[PDB]
Each structure stands twice: as C-alpha cells, then as structure tokens.
Design a protein around this ligand. Structure first.
Ligand SMILES: O=c1ccn([C@@H]2O[C@H](COP(=O)(O)O)[C@@H](O)[C@H]2O)c(=O)[nH]1
Ligand SMILES: O=c1ccn([C@@H]2O[C@H](COP(=O)(O)O)[C@@H](O)[C@H]2O)c(=O)[nH]1
Lengths: 318, 318
C-alpha cells in the first residue's frame, strides 16, 4: 500500500522531490554520443551499480553486454534509450521520493519505447522506489479496465495520473480491480501548468465555485465512496507548481490530500512559493516533480542534489 | 487531406458507419479457439483477401504463414490478435466510412499489442480507409509533440481524439507539425456516453452556457486561429450517441462541424434519435462509431451490414 510506502521512502531520503524521466530524441542521441566518446562510462556504472543486480526482462542480454554495432540502428537506439534512463535513475535515486515517467516520451518509436518503459518500471520496482506513470488516462469504464491492466498489472506502477472531464465514476475502474480486492492510487488533473489553463479550470464554475474546486470536491466524494484510504490508497490531485492561489486553496479545502506538482525548472514554477502555499507537515503530500531541469542538466546528480537542498531549506522554514 | 478523403470515402461506401476495433482478451482467445477448430478459415481469408496483397511490417513472416505452436504462447497470442483485427477489417470494410481503434486495448500485453496496432494502422493505410486513434490525448505542448509523432508519423493515423481540459493551446501541437507545414485533424471530447457525464460537462457553466458548449466554442475559436480548414483539416467533436440534446445543440451552433458519436450498440445509444438530431447533409460529418455490437456479434459482417442498412434508411428519412 502506497501511503505507507511514500511515508517510509520520505523518511529514507528526507525530501519530496519527484524526478521526471521524460527522455527525448536529443537526450538519447546526446547520451549515445558522449558514451561513445568517453568509452561507455555511464553504462559501466549502470551495470555495476544496479543493486541483487538488476536483470532487465526486455532485451536483457543485449543491455547487460559490448554495445550493439552502429549498423544495427534500432538495437543501438534501444540500448542507449534504456541506459540513458538507468543513468538518470542511478545518478539521482539517493535524492528521489519518487519517479514520474510521462508515457508520451516512450511512444514515438513504436513498441521499442514500451519495452524501454517496462525495463524502467521493472528497475524501479527492483529498487522499490515509488513510481508514477503520467498517462492522464480518461475513458469509459470498460476501456479504463484495459488501462488499469497495463498500468498496474503490466508495469506494476504505484500510481498514475487521470483526467476526469468525463466524470468521477471512471475512478471505480482505475482505483479498484474487478473483484474489488486490489486498490490503486491515482492523481486527478485539477490545475495545470500551461499558460491558458484558466480557460476552463477557472472560468467555468458552479454555484460560485471555480471548476478546479468542483473537480477536486467531486473527486474526493468518489474517493471516499471507494474506500481507498482504508485500503492504504488515495486519489490525489495534480496542481501545477505555478498555480499558487490554487494550491493554497486545495490544501485548505483538503488538508490531508496528496498533491503532485509539476512545473519547477523548465516551466519556471516558483518552488518556494508553491511549497509554502501547498505545505503539509506530512511532506510526501506535495510531490515536486522536476524533469528537464535535471535530465537536460550538465550533471543530473548535481541538479537533483541542488533541488534536494532547496526543498530541505524551504521545509526547514516551514 | 482528411476532409476530401472522408468525402470520397463517403461516396464510395454510402454510409457514415465508423467501425470500432477494440479487441479484448476474450475476443482474441475466442477467435483463436474457433480458428483452431474450423482449421484457420478466417486467417486463410486474411491471407488472400488483403488486396497488392498486404505485407505486415511487424512479425510479417510469421503472420503470413502454418500458425505458431501452442508452446510459443506469446507468438501464438500475437498471431491471433493480428488475425482477429484483420478478420474484422476484411469482414466489414465494404460497410465502413472509417475505423476507430481505442489505444487502451492494445496496451495490456506490453509492446506486443503496440506491434499489433502498428500492423492494423499499416493495413488500413494499405487499404486507404480513414482511421482514428481513440487516445483522448492531453498534456502540455512539449509532451503533446511526442504524442503527435506516435499518432501521425509512426501510425500515420488520419485523426485522433483529444481532451482539452487543460486548454485549447494544446491543439497547436497536435494539429500542426513543428515547422507549421503539415496539418492534422483531431476530435475533442465535448459530451461523453458515461452515465455521470453531466457532472462537469453540463453542471459547470460560464455566462449561462454549459461547459460542453464553452468547450466547443473555444475549440472552434482555436481551430480557426490554426487555419486547419484552409489546409484540408478540422477539429471535430466527440458527442455521445446518447447525448441527444447536446448533439442537436452542437449541430445548431456549428452547422459545418465534424462529429464523432460513440455509444450505439453495447451502450444502447439511440442511432435514429442521435442521427436525426446531429444530422448534416454532408453525412461524413456524423461518424457513428459501433464497436462491440459488431466485434462481439456472431457475424461481424452481418452486424455491420445491418447498421449500414439502418443508417441508409434513417438518412433517407432525412
Ligand atoms: O499541468 C501539468 C501536468 C503534467 N505535466 C507533466 O509534468 C512533466 C513536466 O516536466 P518538466 O517540465 O519538469 O520537464 C511533463 O511530463 C509534463 O507532461 C506538466 O508539466 N504540467
Ligand atoms: O464518450 C465516449 C468517448 C469514447 N468512447 C469510446 O468509443 C468506443 C465505444 O465502443 P462500443 O461501446 O461501441 O464497443 C470505446 O472505444 C470507448 O472507449 C465512448 O464509448 N464514449
């Protein structure tokens, strides 16, 4: 159960930093270039530092090797995609409460990237680090059951994100299995980081309440009807790191809620302002996601350490 | 460009029936059982009737063969998943304006199902039948670019579905490539078929207008700013087949809009009532999606022919 897992992890790493692992083609190609030049230094670390060492299920023999030849363009790309991901994990895991992998990044190459994603989730499962698939899933119940199988049975993710524009009944098919015997956590989109996010989230309303509030309220009504919390799980909220007024409102209305807050770093969200406004003494309840500001930095480990330090200093103020 | 493609196809098949291809585990297993017993009758048709015959890129040699042995459980499953999909297509293509494949169904088995999905889209591309990926995509622009690559470059889909809870700016990154030189169509969720769909879509409002209307209006404002229609493309709307009041309102507000209307068949939507309310003389502008009522019927070809007939009779009334 996730609530205990997050609490245990929080005490181990003393942070609420969530590392975003969203690799793009340039990331992979660049890592490949630098590894070819430095003689595969980061892959060597991946192979020794995976502790009980990890055995990838998808292309394990080739990943655990010398690298594929340049003539094998697909295999080479798969090798360097997997090892890029493992490199980020190994460079940053000491500083991470969780990892969030955005599904979109693992799709442009067809099934190749899904095998990578499987190896990533399997590695995180090996390390027992909390995991989130940013899939923003939304559909009718029958279809949602199939998303559930992929996210929770196949990837064995700890949580995912969901978009509830359709209604809250969909939560019944993502947060519970068929038999009503296994329970899963999700984070519902409430306020997003994009510039025009107010157009529906704030401008629409009911009975004096902005849409994002109505969405949050209805979500927790459903979470209570599903008995998630008695079964060690929760429905959390995605609230953008640049959404200062909203994160304050959400923490006020739902003191015990779990918030996932992307937007610090590449998107210029004010970490200190958001963490202050969103603060919970139980600080696993504000996951501060940082992707590109770590994965595209000269030194992912140093970047992660820096955010870890900032968050520590801000938590101390609070 | 899609608008001409749909018009041409409409004149060829004289219908607006959109076949949903959402195979579940029971569908695949059942097809496998019956093929083993009838001596692979449907696969034989798949192999001869694919015209210039189709050559699958993913596992083509094994798919074009005798079937895999039962000991090879994964290969067997892939073989029967692909051939189930090809069977539905071959049994129904004479009656289909388009096919809509819901992404969720192609995920529970990991990368295996994505290879199947690639072969499905590639076959439809071979046949030049209009295609829709029901992915309900929603994210920030940077991430949306990666969904675009998968949907439009990799799968070469004609269109997809999108959820615009985040805002309409996201349309810029799904409907246009980076260079602003290729244009793509999408259908935005407006009104959905699930029982509690009114909770946000109708109960939220702005200035007397229900949410689904505000969403539609803002969508078309953005579609016009993107110049899709001058480039042969459109942003359409998903409006449930059981959403009679809303489909009427949407057709009234946007006489020239393209509607995708799921819900007939398994979900009990009233085809005649919806088609009447949503009617356009340009009848490719109401795609009536029917999935399970065809794919789980004793005879997909007969089921498709029946819907084809009903739609013809209703269009004649109108
Ligand atoms: O409102 C939201 C919801 C989700 N994300 C996701 O969070 C991550 C932000 O990554 P980065 O900007 O830190 O690289 C990406 O996966 C993005 O899709 C946002 O940025 N904003
Ligand atoms: O409001 C919506 C939006 C999408 N779909 C999708 O349309 C298809 C309906 O299939 P069926 O009920 O005809 O089998 C499924 O892919 C489902 O996910 C709906 O049913 N309703």
């Amino acid at each position: 159960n996730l609530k205990i897992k997050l609490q245990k992890r929080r005490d181990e790493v003393n942070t609420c930093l969530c590392i975003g692992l969203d690799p793009d083609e340039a990331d992979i190609k660049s890592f490949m270039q630098s590894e070819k030049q430095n003689g595969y230094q980061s892959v060597k670390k991946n192979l020794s530092n995976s502790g009980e060492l990890f055995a990838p299920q998808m292309g394990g023999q080739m990943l655990l090797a010398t690298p594929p030849k340049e003539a094998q363009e697909k295999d080479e790309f798969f090798y360097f995609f997997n090892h890029f991901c493992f490199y980020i994990i190994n460079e940053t895991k000491e500083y991470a409460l969780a990892y969030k992998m955005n599904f979109a990044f693992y799709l442009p190459y067809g099934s190749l990237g899904v095998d990578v994603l499987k190896n990533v989730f399997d590695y995180l499962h090996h390390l027992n680090v909390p995991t989130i698939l940013d899939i923003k899933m939304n559909d009718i119940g029958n279809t949602v059951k199939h998303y559930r199988k992929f996210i929770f049975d196949y990837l064995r993710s700890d949580s995912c994100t969901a978009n509830i524009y359709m209604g809250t009944q969909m939560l019944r098919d993502i947060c519970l299995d068929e038999e009503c015997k296994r329970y899963y956590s999700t984070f519902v989109l409430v306020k997003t980081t994009n510039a025009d996010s107010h157009i529906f989230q704030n401008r629409l309303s009911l009975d004096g309440k902005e849409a994002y509030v109505v969405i949050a309220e209805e979500v927790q009504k459903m979470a209570k009807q599903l008995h998630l919390e008695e079964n060690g799980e929760f429905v959390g909220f995605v609230v953008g790191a640049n959404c200062y007024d909203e994160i304050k409102k959400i923490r006020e209305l739902f003191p015990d809620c779990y918030i996932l807050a992307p937007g610090v770093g590449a998107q210029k969200g004010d970490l200190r302002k958001m963490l202050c406004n969103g603060y919970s003494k139980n600080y696993e309840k504000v996951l501060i996601n940082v992707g590109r500001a770590i994965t595209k930095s000269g030194s992912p480990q140093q970047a992660a350490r820096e955010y870890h330090q900032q968050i520590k200093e801000v938590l101390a103020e609070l």
